[PDB]
Amino acid sequence: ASPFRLASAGEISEVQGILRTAGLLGPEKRIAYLGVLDPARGAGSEAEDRRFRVFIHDVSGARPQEVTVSVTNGTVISAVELDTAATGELPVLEEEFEVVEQLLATDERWLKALAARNLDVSKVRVAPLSAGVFEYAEERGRRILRGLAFVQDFPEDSAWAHPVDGLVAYVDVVSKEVTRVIDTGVFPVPAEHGNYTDPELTGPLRTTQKPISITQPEGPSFTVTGGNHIEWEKWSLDVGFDVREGVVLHNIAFRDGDRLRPIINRASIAEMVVPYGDPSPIRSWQNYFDTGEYLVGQYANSLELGCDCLGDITYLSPVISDAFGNPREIRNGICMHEEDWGILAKHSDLWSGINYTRRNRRMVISFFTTIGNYDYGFYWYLYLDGTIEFEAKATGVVFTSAFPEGGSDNISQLAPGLGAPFHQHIFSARLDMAIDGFTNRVEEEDVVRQTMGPGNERGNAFSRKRTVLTRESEAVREADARTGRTWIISNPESKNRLNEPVGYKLHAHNQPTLLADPGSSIARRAAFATKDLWVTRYADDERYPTGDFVNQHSGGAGLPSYIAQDRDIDGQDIVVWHTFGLTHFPRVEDWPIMPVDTVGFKLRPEGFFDRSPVLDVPAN
Amino acid sequence: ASPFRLASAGEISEVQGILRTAGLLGPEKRIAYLGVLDPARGAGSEAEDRRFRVFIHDVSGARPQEVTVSVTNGTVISAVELDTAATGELPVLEEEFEVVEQLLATDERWLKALAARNLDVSKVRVAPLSAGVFEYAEERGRRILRGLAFVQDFPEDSAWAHPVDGLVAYVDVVSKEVTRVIDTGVFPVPAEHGNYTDPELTGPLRTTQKPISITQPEGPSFTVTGGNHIEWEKWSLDVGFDVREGVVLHNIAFRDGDRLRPIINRASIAEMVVPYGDPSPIRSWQNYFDTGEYLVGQYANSLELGCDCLGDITYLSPVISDAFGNPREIRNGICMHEEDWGILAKHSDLWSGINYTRRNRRMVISFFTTIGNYDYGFYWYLYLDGTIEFEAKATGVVFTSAFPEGGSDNISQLAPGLGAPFHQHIFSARLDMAIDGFTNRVEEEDVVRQTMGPGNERGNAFSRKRTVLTRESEAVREADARTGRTWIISNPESKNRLNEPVGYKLHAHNQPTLLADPGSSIARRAAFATKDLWVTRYADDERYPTGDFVNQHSGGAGLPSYIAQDRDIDGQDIVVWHTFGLTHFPRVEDWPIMPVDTVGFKLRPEGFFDRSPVLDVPAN
Ligand code: 11R
Ligand code: 11R
């Protein structure tokens, strides 16, 4: 019955049928994006209307459309033709991945480049890479992918070991034409293999790891109802999935006594971008918006038990649309489990003689996606004590280049002749806040040092200050780790028993934000990534920090456009957008397959509860 | 046979016998500190000499002594009388804890203060609190403790709920005299109880938590030999224990192929301080050096299976000296276990068709200590991929005060009338580095932004810079989170296969450092805490960032004195001292017993290995 239930195969097939019936999904049409829309504010009273949003591409060269369908009512709500030169190209289609290599394989310029390097065209893989927006006027309004080449010596070879530097091509994937082939000169193609399952490289596998068995003999402590509604240790939420954002959490709330208290209305990773810091023209255009351009949900892995997710696991298998509107299941695409998390609280008291220890646990909701060379795990955690956390785990194979003779200020060496250009992985978490309901505000809290003097004669005092962000113009904030800066989301109309507004505190990792020059294309297209925290007034059409159409789309949309409205955010329905990222100078240890590295953030209750919320946790 | 083995009960009894025989341990003498000394540099060649360092207090008022004993040879190596007014008082003795309350109970001034507040003296607990160094000239050369009062309504009551504000006393614990009683006025003693095992407060305990069973059917993957030598997944180390520092790691090394490669010679938490930020004269003197003044090892908890440490646990039970030189075992005082740590590396490749997933694990070595109201867990982690991490877990009961009518800039409210003064918990990790041996250097590495222009026409480039710290005068460094600042310890004489010096990178959390005014007593006594990173040239007598005797000791010793020597640290035997801490503005959720919060740091290999060190980890 829940309006927040996952899309079913039947709903997707029904959208297909509605579009077909309406004349919007003939044989030349392809679905580039399809997802369920969230219910409107105050929709709980009215009967449900399951609506789906669809981006439809046309392979014959006609203009694409944005369409909203009511699957409940069997109707098209709206359909509008898109001018992609203005509003952006549609996301990259899975079917376009192969096209770059295929077209290049019979292009005389490409073949000349490969022949100059004595490379067999049958062995040359070409990555289908998003193009961005640079100086090439002919690309405006065209669906372009750029191609970088990697040699695969045999079918099971890791092509990433053998980058073909000095060469890049640009391809129109609709007209099926190669627009440009740029050859700046030959570089040696690195020869060492990077085959991490080859015994020659691994050596004898370890026999020293004894089994770790994690079981729950009475099953898990969480329940799943309605397909995706989770209840666990006072927490209540719905686990959604979208082909763009991946796992999306809805209606995160905590049962405090008799009252179900909302905390976050919607939590997602609304964008992620990988900007590269190598000024070589072969890669200086490289910025992968894995979420906005590629759709990370689409490439979610099927996760194997005892391998990807360990313990007593409950899986969800979300359904997405293929290019033709047929449903496709991602079997075991979402993992859900609880795990022990060490000591929760402990005290051994010298006066009362009471010794007290309690254990912590967390609920984990995760997926793993693969975007070419990269593989990312997205993990949401709920803890017994009210803490909410997100963690991204970055692994896969590093994106490679040649390592220049005489070194580089922008590339590190991984193996003889093999380079890894410097880059960042920068995430935007969109948190549609609902601290005890929708009337919320944000304060920036800094530690305040105090001078020795009257009122502080020993020079020991310290304090803090809170500054309310009253309007969107004042709500674009930067980190200040030195002053312990955090941001508190509170409800000014809901007080705890000590007469203080209830709140949650966001604790950032204070990693560097976007490093690119502020006048670059990427600083404009990923403007969100230049600042740690943004707060907007909620609006139904302000979904992504980069806007709806990121592919080959200049600045003009997204967060900078939203905040120009300068709306009241002091005790209103607000959205926090937190930028956080990893700055990666690849190390030799990252090669030939990279150990996981992490980044994230958390929010902790801050006078939300009237005392510790875990006094009722039992011993042992 | 290992010279790094834990002290045995026999060794401690033998030190006692040697001291007795030498005339140094008569009936008026008490042992305030006893610990084994590490072997001298280059001692491996010579036969072993187990030496012990002892601080001996005299209850009759005579001067204390510092003594070094050779237990192997049955000799006193050295014995020197200490002038405590100059070099500092000895650590607080466990037997002195009760003395403050006992002396105050018959003092007319104290009784008058309690009577003004209608408090039964039999119900008033007095915390035995370190005194520091302030304006009281009579305290110089005397062993003083200060007393703050807390009412205990009945034997099992949590006295922390009932602070008696406006009152503090100072006591000479040797002459057994009350030197001062200060009463600045009555405050209401908060009345609500804080009894976290009382059903009235907890309510009905949860019945929703289903068991999590963690077992190892073939036992653990680590071995313990020689009592405390651990081998686990290529790692080699010795687990030491000292009554001051607690768990100390020695000889951390990694077996890379056939070669045992040193990484860290000695790792410890060499100090921890809890400075309070309330300018009230009742607490403005409050700074607890839990390590230096109280000795955190002494109060290590006995850790219960399935409660404190979960899984297949191997315990060590370290032996310490009581006040008379008799051995006392801390049963199950150190936990050792390995645990699963999620995904280690993962890639699903679109060209090779190979799908690869490997799991991570970490070895955990921990203890938990209790210092009055506070309880801290100290955790060291070794990971499969070469990462070394420390984490402190802070819990217990928050130190309380009255909450002032009309609020406070330096105290938060926890319950009606109940306050928690702001404070920090600041740790110093002393890492005696040995990256591939002892010839090491430290570089500070910052991200470098680049301007759009020639050589960077698209404004995408970014880089980094490394600055070698050549001498101790240049080696007192601060965090810069905005520029992604880290510190690399390398061996300039040991290169990896790419001809780059092998190294490890220290990743700090960049939390605020000491907030007190730089002219305060605490800024001088805890000078280490004002800066994030210090590097010294190794010396056998430079053990603690605060010197050997912290109790009632002014500035003059410790790190500022060590670095004045301005020694060469560029390719030498060096020591890194990392300051890291928690700044605590207590929340209502911290009351009546606080959920764990954490802080720490890690070091990751940085061109130490010739490729990923975990290619030989098997599937599943
Ligand atoms: C942004 N950026 C930097 C970047 C950089 C590069 C690329 C890029 O683009 C974005 C790419 C995003 C997509 C990434 C998701 C991961 C894709 C993985 C490939 C999908 C796939 C597609 C096809 N196949 Ru098959 N196969 C066998 C074992 C394991 C497999 C894993 C995956 C297979 C696959 C397997 N197969 C079936 C039977 C016998 C042999 C084989 C082989 C041999 C060698 C390779 C693959 N397979 N297969 C081959 C031919 C036809 C059909 C077929 C099938 C059908 C169903 C299942 C498996 N295979 C972006
Ligand atoms: C820096 N700062 C802010 C600060 C602030 C405040 C203080 C402070 O000082 C530093 C203090 C550092 C020391 C902290 C370490 C923790 C000390 C814990 C107290 C030790 C202790 C000391 C004594 N006893 Ru008992 N006892 C029973 C159960 C559980 C117990 C736990 C601990 C017991 C204890 C227990 N006992 C035995 C038999 C019957 C009843 C009892 C009771 C009842 C009520 C309380 C305690 N006990 N006991 C009582 C009397 C005589 C002997 C005795 C023993 C002997 C052996 C074991 C247990 N007990 C510093």
Ligand SMILES: [Cu+2]
């Ligand atoms: Cu990376």
Ligand SMILES: [Cu+2]
């Ligand atoms: Cu604290």
Ligand code: NA
């Ligand atoms: Na909101």
Ligand code: NA
């Ligand atoms: Na060293």
